Amino acid sequence: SQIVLPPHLERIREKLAENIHELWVMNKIELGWQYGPVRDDNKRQHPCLVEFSKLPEQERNYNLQMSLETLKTLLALGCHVGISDEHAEDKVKKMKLPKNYQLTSGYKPAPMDLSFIKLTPSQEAMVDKLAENAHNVWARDRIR
């Protein structure tokens, strides 16, 4: 909470929050899950697969806030803020997946394919630390 976002990282915060609900629904569709009227895992139907508005707005807001907390954790571990270029921010590419893996909504099936992006071990350990901190947050939630 003591960490405050710089305004530029803050545009990127809301924009990547939209990117995060996109990634969440895309993980949901990568799981090969089914969409239905009722929110039951046992009968294997959930209407939380298509877009953010189809979700409960409070659930989407909590998704946004946990993405915000995840990037605040990224800041807390002390990552130096870096940006490639302004074009890579104004215009992001839209990879197309086949129709089978195409989302029912109008969003791009994924931001861009994992082949061209190789993530360095410096941030690989960074993600591990994110994993421990998220596990600790869930654990204190269970303790509460």
Ligand X SMILES: Nc1ncnc2c1ncn2[C@@H]1O[C@H](COP(=O)(O)OP(=O)(O)OP(=O)(O)O)[C@@H](O)[C@H]1O
Distance between CA atoms of 130 and 70, rounded to whole angstroms? 7
CB of 38 to ligand X, least distance (A): 15
Tell whether residue 65 is a contact of ligand X (CB under 6 A): no
Tell whether residue 142 is a contact of ligand X (CB under 6 A): yes
Q: Which is nearer to ligand X, 58 or 120 (CB)?
A: 58
Q: Rounded to 5 degrees, what angle do the CA atoms 126, 128, 132 make?
A: 115
Among 10, 40, 59, 113, binds ligand X (CB under 6 A): 59
Tell whether residue 141 is a contact of ligand X (CB under 6 A): yes
Task: Tell me which H or E stretch contains 131.
Answer: helix 121-143
Give the three-class secondary structure for 40: strand
Binding-site ranges for ligand X (CB under 6 A): 58-59, 62, 138, 141-142
